Ligand binder design. Structure first.
Ligand SMILES: Cc1cc2nc3c(=O)[nH]c(=O)nc-3n(C[C@H](O)[C@H](O)[C@H](O)COP(=O)(O)OP(=O)(O)OC[C@H]3O[C@@H](n4cnc5c(N)ncnc54)[C@H](O)[C@@H]3O)c2cc1C
Ligand SMILES: Cc1cc2nc3c(=O)[nH]c(=O)nc-3n(C[C@H](O)[C@H](O)[C@H](O)COP(=O)(O)OP(=O)(O)OC[C@H]3O[C@@H](n4cnc5c(N)ncnc54)[C@H](O)[C@@H]3O)c2cc1C
Ligand SMILES: Cc1cc2nc3c(=O)[nH]c(=O)nc-3n(C[C@H](O)[C@H](O)[C@H](O)COP(=O)(O)OP(=O)(O)OC[C@H]3O[C@@H](n4cnc5c(N)ncnc54)[C@H](O)[C@@H]3O)c2cc1C
Ligand SMILES: Cc1cc2nc3c(=O)[nH]c(=O)nc-3n(C[C@H](O)[C@H](O)[C@H](O)COP(=O)(O)OP(=O)(O)OC[C@H]3O[C@@H](n4cnc5c(N)ncnc54)[C@H](O)[C@@H]3O)c2cc1C
Lengths: 371, 371, 369, 370
């Protein structure tokens, strides 16, 4: 009395974004992270205008921009031949390690006074406003946020209709030193998406995060016993990416690299009663448009906006989904099409349609940076 | 009544910005333009993050972004050799025709209900809150804004201490078709600053505004009777910029081109009683950093911010100048140094110091996009 | 006066006829087809072949109207993987008819007797050549220069290892369309390799300001790539930067898909019979030395016949002196073909260039690598 | 009946004449004024014409081994590449001068040419007499004045000439390639690097082989820094920073010289039994890189005309008539290029510029058409 209370399950980008945005609006917010430490996995990440605008709204933009990188261009190669160079007509974008982004959100959530619990796993949620932890402890609140990832127990304990999919193939994602000097002549501040189908299917997404750190995604079929191996098989990667040898040598030193498969989900509904699902829990998607976390953050931020309208929580949640979900649905669908067709291999695929989610400004609720 | 009243002298970028920002804050605003038509001269213009943020604050950003251009890179040439390519670490920037920008500000000021008078010339202002027109008509107001350009009569009728300066050399600025196809192979969406000292001092700043329009600045010494001639001496320009021949041919058709010299002013004070000087009236500068209008817009917008603090107008004006002027002073000084030393000819000159003004966010009052 | 009968009016036969005639031989040459003509569109010659032409007095007629690219470039999947200029070693590209005309005109100026529609059907080491008219000709020397299907060779019975590939290529002369090709380095040789999305290759070879020589290589089991007249779409699809030239190529109704063919013989001579060119040593074309070696060998035969020996002895000395250069070139070129080595670029090594470096006039290797 | 020739001068022209004469059964003695056989000027370009002479001298393969043909002849103006030329296959070659000189000396020695160092011709007589600085008077059927632009064979006789020296010059050096240190680029190319701004400074960059680089540093004599020897490292690195590793080695060369350009044109190349060849007769501006080329073609051609059964006197007249217009035209065009700085524009090796290079002295025809 009379403070609205929110329990947030999940300490990833969506959960942290929701917790900050609610807390800024005067909610009493508690956040539960299942693992032993607040931490992001996946090495590196791209954000665009939409996600950057969310960060502005969270008061964490400038902490993220300091120590992250915008390449001079987004370049695509096919068999070492440059097939496209894209700068998106000025649309802002940024590459950073996941921990850089995650640290900035943690720092902000903590500074705002978000109640943070780790080793705290949500195992059940009730639409009347109850969150049950693995300890058996039952929490009552006016709002429950399921931001607990693609394997969401908040979602599955309630039983939402879904269409869930797991990929055949996967990739290895790593942070290594830039080795820029050792790379010699070239445009080594660029994003370079290096595709190959001959002599083998192997791809590297080359992604500078700053002056010190390079984010690499190494993509090879699961049925390729060498290309999919971790720690990496140096020989098969150097063979097809010899110009990256200095960085690949450093990558081969990382004993805890993982080969991860892609996973998606689409839900009929994102809400039930006082429970809202946000992020991968609601809309895990293919990463072709690099909008999974971007949409997760736009959605979590937009949830806080609809909760300011004076409505009941239940009504605000229905209004939220109705307003914001089509942007995500369209983005998820197009990114799935790109993934299935290997569209990015052709270059020049960041079309106006592809950049729709990136152009969205969640703060002013309009589309900006026209294409 | 209790409705604060502002009289704004000058219908340029500074005047229009001040009128919009004040009107949005509930001022009763009247704007006076000396000439017979609201219109901008000078062909094309660059804005950066700081000015784009002002546009966001004026509710005119997206009208400007639609139909303007961000080059993939800002390139510098010396004797046809590329000596630098700069993308400013993601810092937003934009090139556009002056009429594109000016139309967007006029549409917005008009839409908001600003009282617009043309053929209305301010010839005297009084710090107690009086503006006199050339008609002899005397207007009383709570705030007087001198946005009447480098030859400000609002300023000179009051007698501000100044250090005024006029260049010996100048340039011809024009809008022509892109002729992109005709330019053949190259990077013709780039900004390209093409310097030459041999065989003659001639420079062209090549600045695409959109798919249809190209902004060209043709710089030659005033003592050069061919290079400084208007309409342009096609031969002496084609001779040193042969790759631009299709565009230069179009430029030669422009009968109303002008050769304009540069002009600067620096004032000990920007305010006196209820009178505030904004834009070129207060701080006309060398255009090396392309920040003259950017600073003018930031200062005009920031004026409206300080007027929301519940102070007397007089105190608010003093607080405004104290808060905002050092950014402009430093920018003016550095741009003057660059101009005197021809620093831009070396390339790579958009350093962190050069970009200080561009990095400023007038909305949040912090510096963004670190360099 | 010594008499020679030469079977075959290709590069090897014409070279032999001219070289012998210059040395005072009385020479008649027999061409099986009804007109003197060279097939195969375009051809590369190197230092060795150019030196032969100098020795034949036909160099300048060949250099006028032929082309040396600024560089020999190799692409893999449109990526430039090498540019080679061979440390100044001279080389030249030309239409086959240009080279063939220069040789025919020289032979005619010298008084070589040429009979078209005259086929050698049998030969005898004692010095007899039988024509398809049944006429038996007697001579001090018989030159079997009658190509890979040599009847001079097969009527005598030379032990050989003869081979034909299942795959082949289409060779055409088209206009340069240089302006329509827009920006690039369109005076270069460009060997444009691809294995993905399909196995298709174009050897791009400018012959002069007007004529471009193209070799379009696709497997026989590819019904589109191997089709004649060309399936325009499948070629434009993988070589879109060549569309103006391919459009012209598509108009060529008489285009052929020719298979590769090689032979290696234990012996090149039998009594007064000498086999030269494809009759003796047809090879894979990777090193572009088939005619080069043929011409060096035919020219060298005339040299050994000036030593005062019996023809029989001179022929043995000729083979002993000159064949290892050809054997090594043939073996390396076959290795390159089998391993698709040219696809890697930078493959014109000192070893690859051995034949090209040979100067048949001074009998030394020049242009070191 | 053994014909006898005395050749004054042991540079490219003298050695070429001596070899060619000797090959044709002349008894040949050659006199070199300096105390040792040696070529100065660091490096040198030869073209088809000069390479053909070497073939005719039986010295081609010794020259080709250890010399270099660039992939392309490139020109820069203010660091911008303005042309790349390969001359439609026309053979050319860059080498150190000592490499060329050594091949010629070794060949003359193998043929039995009698060479006297520290032997200066101080006077000549058209009747066939050569006077040495020992006062010895030599008699011969042919006297070859191959004694350079300051020819005493020429001046003792008195040939009408127009001789000229420039105020400006250049520094020519051989340095290591430092190819790895040069990093990314096309460092096997010839690169003629022109600048007029901020200062008039030019470097002709000329690789001779895997180990040696030939540099020509051209600055006006009135520039006390650019014309300084040993080189003012700073002013060269300033305008050619991409060549710093090579220039650092260049700065170590204490015996560097600033040499001035010299030309001469004579109304006549012959007098009685005396023939003037090379710089003695036709020193020219170096734009077309044909000074030694022409000298060698002319020296080789002289031996050809002496094989016709004429008197030496008649053969010399026929020689000059046959061969001089190629040299006259080359010299005139080269001087025009030098005066107009034409090479700075690129693409200047036109058919006309390449006329001398295209000439084949062995078959007496023009080859490699342009
Ligand atoms: C290969 C790949 C590349 C990608 N690249 C990009 C990109 O460049 N840009 C971009 O925007 N997106 C990208 N994405 C997508 C992005 O990773 C996801 O959309 C994003 O991380 C989703 O965040 P989230 O907070 O919803 O889920 P998660 O990041 O999975 O976080 C949920 C948090 O859930 C905690 N948790 C789980 N279960 C419980 C529980 N029961 N109780 C309490 N806590 C729990 C998890 O441990 C964790 O701390 C990429 C994805 C993949 C697979
Ligand atoms: C060559 C050059 C290039 C430049 N490029 C850029 C650039 O790329 N980016 C950038 O941000 N800046 C640039 N600038 C600077 C920019 O042009 C100015 O700073 C800007 O236009 C100043 O706007 P203002 O409204 O203060 O003045 P002005 O634009 O001069 O406008 C004042 C308005 O004053 C009206 N007026 C005048 N007198 C009276 C009066 N007595 N009563 C009523 N109205 C009056 C004038 O007619 C006009 O309508 C450049 C300047 C130059 C010279
Ligand atoms: C695809 C391909 C590309 C090649 N590219 C090059 C290249 O770039 N450079 C190069 O040097 N080589 C190249 N070659 C090889 C070159 O084509 C041959 O080595 C050369 O043509 C052999 O010439 P020849 O005179 O021995 O035989 P052929 O050219 O076959 O000529 C023999 C002549 O034989 C006449 N004839 C045949 N039978 C009789 C008979 N019974 N009686 C009388 N006359 C007869 C034939 O009709 C014809 O006129 C290439 C070969 C191929 C297949
Ligand atoms: C800067 C520059 C660059 C050049 N680059 C090229 C180039 O790239 N390619 C090219 O072909 N040419 C080039 N040349 C021109 C070339 O150097 C000359 O044309 C060539 O060296 C002339 O040779 P020569 O034998 O006539 O004279 P020299 O080389 O001058 O030789 C005469 C020889 O004369 C000996 N001697 C002198 N006086 C007497 C005497 N009285 N008695 C006996 N011996 C005497 C001299 O000491 C010496 O040993 C260049 C010239 C210059 C200036």
């Amino acid at each position: 009395g009379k403070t609205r209370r929110a329990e947030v399950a999940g300490g990833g980008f969506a959960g942290l974004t929701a917790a900050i945005a609610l807390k800024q609006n005067g909610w009493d917010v508690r956040l539960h992270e299942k693992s032993s430490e607040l931490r992001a996995f996946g090495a590196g990440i791209y954000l665009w205008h939409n996600g950057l605008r969310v960060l502005e709204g969270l008061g964490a933009l400038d902490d993220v921009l300091q120590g992250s990188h915008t390449p001079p261009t987004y370049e695509t190669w096919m068999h070492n031949k440059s097939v496209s160079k894209e700068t998106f007509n000025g649309l802002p974008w940024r590459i950073m390690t996941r921990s850089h982004l995650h640290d900035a959100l943690v720092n902000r959530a903590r500074a705002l006074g978000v109640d943070i619990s780790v080793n705290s796993e949500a195992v059940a949620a009730d639409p009347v406003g109850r969150l049950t932890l693995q300890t058996g402890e039952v929490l009552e609140a006016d709002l429950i946020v399921g931001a607990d990832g693609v394997g969401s127990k908040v979602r599955d304990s309630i039983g939402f209709k879904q269409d869930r999919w797991v990929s055949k193939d996967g990739l290895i994602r790593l942070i290594v030193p830039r080795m820029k000097k050792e790379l010699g002549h070239g445009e080594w501040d660029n994003t370079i998406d290096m595709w190959n189908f001959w002599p083998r299917v192997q791809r590297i997404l080359y992604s500078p995060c700053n002056e010190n750190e390079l984010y690499l995604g190494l993509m090879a079929p699961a049925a390729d016993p060498r290309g999919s191996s971790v720690p990496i098989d140096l020989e098969v990667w150097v063979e097809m990416f010899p110009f990256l040898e200095p960085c690949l040598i450093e990558a081969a030193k990382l004993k805890t690299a993982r080969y991860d498969k892609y996973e998606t989900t689409k839900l009929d509904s994102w809400t039930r009663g006082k429970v809202a699902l946000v992020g991968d829990a609601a809309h895990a998607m293919c990463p072709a448009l690099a909008q999974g976390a971007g949409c997760a953050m736009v959605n979590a931020f937009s949830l806080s906006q609809d909760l300011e309208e004076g409505s009941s929580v239940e009504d605000a949640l229905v209004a939220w989904e109705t307003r914001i979900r089509p942007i995500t649905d369209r983005c998820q669908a197009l990114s799935g099409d790109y993934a299935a067709n290997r569209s990015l291999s052709k270059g020049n695929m960041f079309t106006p349609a592809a950049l729709e989610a990136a152009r969205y400004d969640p703060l002013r609720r309009v589309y900006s940076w026209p294409q």
